[PDB]
C-alpha cells in the first residue's frame, strides 16, 4: 500500500512505483514448488544419506 | 515389463526371504549400509510456519 | 542358528502367542499358491504379455495349530533390514 | 597413525598438513572400529580392570555364586558392559562366572567411546602440537559408525 500511494494526481507525474508483493511472495515461498515437481528436492533439503561402506 | 524369467518370478513369491524384514541377502565384495536418512517434523511448511 | 525370526500369533478368542522359530514348513504354507513351471509356461504361451498374463496367473489362485493360520513377523531393531516391505492400506469409495 | 602422520614432513604450507593429518587420523579411527566388529563377541577382550579405589559397577547377585572363583579376585575387578534387553547397560564381572560365558551382546557403544576418547586426546595433542593449534580432533562415532553395534 505504500508502493501504490500517490503524491500527485497527474498520471504522467505520479509518484506511485511498482509493488513488491507478488515478486517477494514468489521469491521466498512459491520458489519451492520445484521441490514438489517429481524431483525429490524436499528429500535433498534434509537427505543426510549415511551409507557406510 | 522386461522380465527374462517369468516362472522364476512367479516362484519367487513363495520364498519367505522375499517377504521378511531381516532376511538373508540373496560373494559380497563391498556393502553400503544406509543407516540414516531424513528426520521427523522437518516439513518446509512446518519450518516456515514456525 | 541365530539370528531368528520372532512371530506373533493371534488366537481365538484372544491371546498373543509369541513364537520364535529356527525353521518352519513354509513349503506347506505357500504350497496352495505354488504354480508348477509347466502351468506358468503354458499360460505364457497362451498370453505373451506382462499385464494380461499376470491376470491369468492371479486368477489361477492351539498356538501350534494357529502358527499356520496367523503369523505377524516382529521387527527386530538389532538386525539389519534387507527387504522394503510396505503395508498399503487402500481405502475405497466403491 | 603417529608414525604415518609425522612422515608427512613433505614440504607444504602448515594449513595443508593439518587437514591431510586429520583425514588420516579419522581413517585410523575407521580402521579401528571396523576391526572392533570382528571381535564384538569377545567379552574378555572388551574388559576393563577397575581398581578397588575407583568407582565400580554394582555386583550382580549371581556373581556371588562363583564357588572356587571368587578367591582369584584380589586387586582387579574385570568388568564388561553388556546391553541386555534395550537401553540399559549393565556390568558383568567377567572373572566371577564359569567359562565359556554366555552373555547379551557386548555394549561396544560404551567401551569404544572411552577408547576413542583417549585416542582423540592424543590426536588433539599431536594436531595442536606439530602444526597450528585450534583443532580438537573429534570422530563422529555416534553418526558415522555407531550402527555397527547399537
Ligand atoms: C504464526 C503464524 N502467523 C500467521 N497467522 C497470523 C495466522 O495463522 C492467523 C490465524 C489464522 C487462522 C485462524 C483460525 C481461526 C479459527 C479457526 C481456524 N483458524 C486464526 C488465526 S500463520 C501462522 S503459521 N505460519 O504457523 O501457519
The main β sheet of chain D shows up as: 3 strands, antiparallel
Question: Main sheet of chain A, how many strands, which sense, barrel?
Answer: none
The quaternary state of the protein chains shown equals part of a larger assembly
How many helical stretches of chain A?
2
Largest chain-chain contact?
B-C, 19 and 23 residues
Sheet/helix structural class of chain A: mainly alpha
Helix and strand sequence of chain A: HHE
Radius of gyration of chain D: 19 Å
% residues in beta strands of chain A: 5-15%
Bound molecules: Pritelivir
PDB class: viral protein
Keywords: replisome, viral protein
Entry title: HSV replication fork complex bound to pritelivir
Chains A, B, C: UL52
Question: Would you write up a description of this structure?
Answer:
This is part of a larger assembly, with 3 copies of chain A and 1 copy of chain D (150 residues). Chain A is mainly alpha-helical. Chain A has helices at 21-28, 41-45; one strand at residues 50-52. The radius of gyration of chain D is 19 Å and the shape is elongated. Chain D has a 3-stranded antiparallel beta sheet. Chain D has 150 residues and is mostly helical. In chain D, strand 2 and strand 3 (90-93) form a beta hairpin. Chain D has helices spanning 2-5, 14-37, 108-130, 141-144; strands at 48-50, 77-82, 90-93. Classes of the chains: A mainly alpha (53), D mainly alpha (150). At the A-B interface, helix 2 and strand 1 of A face strand 1 of B. Strand 1 (50-52) of chain A pairs antiparallel with strand 1 of chain B, so a sheet runs across the interface. Bound molecules: Pritelivir. The PDB classes it as viral protein. The entry lists the keywords HSV, viral protein. HSV replication fork complex bound to pritelivir.
Amino acid at each position: 500500500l505504500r508502493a501504490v500511494t500517490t503524491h500527485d494526481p497527474n498520471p504522467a507525474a505520479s509518484t506511485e512505483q511498482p509493488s513488491p508483493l507478488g515478486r517477494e511472495a514468489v521469491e521466498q515461498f512459491f520458489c519451492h514448488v520445484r521441490a514438489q515437481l517429481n524431483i525429490g528436492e524436499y528429500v535433498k533439503h534434509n537427505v543426510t544419506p549415511r551409507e557406510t561402506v | 515389463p522386461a522380465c527374462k524369467d517369468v516362472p522364476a518370478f512367479v516362484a519367487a513369491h513363495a520364498d519367505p526371504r522375499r517377504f521378511h524384514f531381516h532376511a538373508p541377502p540373496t560373494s559380497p565384495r563391498e556393502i553400503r549400509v544406509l543407516h540414516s536418512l531424513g528426520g521427523d517434523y522437518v516439513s518446509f511448511f512446518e519450518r516456515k510456519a514456525s | 542358528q541365530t539370528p531368528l525370526p520372532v512371530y506373533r500369533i493371534s488366537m481365538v478368542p484372544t491371546g498373543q502367542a509369541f513364537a520364535a522359530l529356527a525353521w518352519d514348513d513354509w513349503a506347506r504354507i505357500t504350497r496352495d499358491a505354488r504354480l508348477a513351471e509347466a502351468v506358468v509356461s503354458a499360460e505364457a504361451a497362451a498370453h505373451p504379455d506382462h499385464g494380461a498374463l499376470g491376470r491369468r496367473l492371479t486368477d489361477r489362485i492351539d498356538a501350534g495349530g494357529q502358527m499356520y493360520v496367523n503369523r505377524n513377523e516382529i521387527f527386530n531393531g538389532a538386525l539389519a533390514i534387507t527387504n522394503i516391505i510396505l503395508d498399503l492400506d487402500i481405502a475405497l469409495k466403491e | 597413525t603417529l608414525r604415518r602422520v609425522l612422515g608427512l614432513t613433505t614440504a607444504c604450507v602448515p594449513e595443508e598438513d593439518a587437514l591431510t593429518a586429520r583425514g588420516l587420523m579419522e581413517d585410523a579411527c575407521d580402521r579401528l572400529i571396523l576391526d572392533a566388529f570382528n571381535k564384538r563377541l569377545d567379552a574378555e577382550y572388551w574388559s576393563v580392570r577397575v581398581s578397588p579405589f575407583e568407582a565400580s559397577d554394582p555386583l550382580p547377585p549371581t556373581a556371588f555364586r562363583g564357588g572356587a572363583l571368587l578367591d582369584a579376585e584380589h586387586y582387579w575387578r574385570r568388568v564388561v558392559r553388556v546391553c541386555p534387553g534395550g537401553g540399559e547397560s549393565v556390568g558383568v564381572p567377567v572373572d566371577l562366572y564359569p567359562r565359556p560365558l554366555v552373555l547379551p551382546p557386548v555394549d561396544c557403544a560404551h567401551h569404544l567411546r572411552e577408547i576413542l576418547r583417549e585416542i582423540e586426546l592424543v590426536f588433539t595433542g599431536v594436531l595442536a602440537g606439530v602444526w597450528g593449534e585450534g583443532g580438537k580432533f573429534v570422530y563422529p562415532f555416534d553418526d558415522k559408525m555407531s550402527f555397527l553395534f547399537a
